Amino acid sequence: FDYLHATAFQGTALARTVEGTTENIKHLTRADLASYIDTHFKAPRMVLAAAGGISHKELVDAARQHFSGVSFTYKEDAVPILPRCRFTGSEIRARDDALPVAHVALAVEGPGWADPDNVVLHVANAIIGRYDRTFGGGKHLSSRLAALA
Amino acid sequence: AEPEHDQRKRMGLKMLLISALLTSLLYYMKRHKWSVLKSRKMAYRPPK
Numbered sequence: 001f002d003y004l005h006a007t008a009f010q011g012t013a014l015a016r017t018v019e020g021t022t023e024n025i026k027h028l029t030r031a032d033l034a035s036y037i038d039t040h041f042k043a044p045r046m047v048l049a050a051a052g053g054i055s056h057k058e059l060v061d062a063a064r065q066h067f068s069g070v071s072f073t074y075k076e077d078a079v080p081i082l083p084r085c086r087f088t089g090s091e092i093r094a095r096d097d098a099l100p101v102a103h104v105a106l107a108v109e110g111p112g113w114a115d116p117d118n119v120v121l122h123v124a125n126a127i128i129g130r131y132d133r134t135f136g137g138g139k140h141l142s143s144r145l146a147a148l149a
Numbered sequence: 150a151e152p153e154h155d156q157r158k159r160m161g162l163k164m165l166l167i168s169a170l171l172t173s174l175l176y177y178m179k180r181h182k183w184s185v186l187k188s189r190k191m192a193y194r195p196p197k
């Protein structure tokens with residue numbers, strides 16, 4: 001799945017692993033870390049969510065107390081508009097025959113969180129569904145791909 | 150000796166035009182399909 005992103009969104013920010021390079025982990029500084037936190041962990045880009053036996057008003061009160069001072073400039077208010085990521089009809093094949101079983105991922109470009117088509121794509125994905133050799137349903141599973149599998 | 154003289158060369162014209170067109174088109178389609186291999190890069194990355 002890392003390789004999938006690395007080639008699907010090749011040449012963009014989405015092509016990077018969440019954990020990062022070995023060199024980066026090696027050489028990241030306290031300044032670099034503190035910079036990330038100050039640059040990204042900012043109030044408008046954060047959501048304090050809660051769920052349980054919690055009074056909402058009591059929640060926003062304790063939140064009002066510990067989630068702190070107002071930003072001064074307009075820069076610190078505005079939420080950044082990320083540069084777009086380019087999809088690439090491409091492949092990456094990392095071959096290792098000593099590896100017991102092979103893994104294959106194939107994907108096309110999606111619509112994004114906003115698009116209402118994401119609902120239909122989930123309905124479609126539900127049709128094909130999923131399987132692993134412990135699915136007790138076996139040959140009688142409704143999913144055609146699972147039945148053929 | 151060859152009454153087909155006129156039609157033969159008339160065909161030769163049609164042939165050469167068609168052949169020129171088709172050879173070019175098929176060359177693109179070949180290059181298009183082979184573009185996957187022609188541009189392909191590979192690396193050797195062991196757990197060295």
Ligand SMILES: CCCCCCCCO[C@@H]1O[C@H](CO)[C@@H](O)[C@H](O)[C@H]1O
Nearest residue numbers: 156159160161163164165167168171
């Ligand atoms: C790849 C090769 C394609 C060759 C196409 C040749 C088509 C020839 O076509 C011929 O041309 C003659 C001259 O007008 C006509 O008399 C014939 O009726 C016609 O069939």
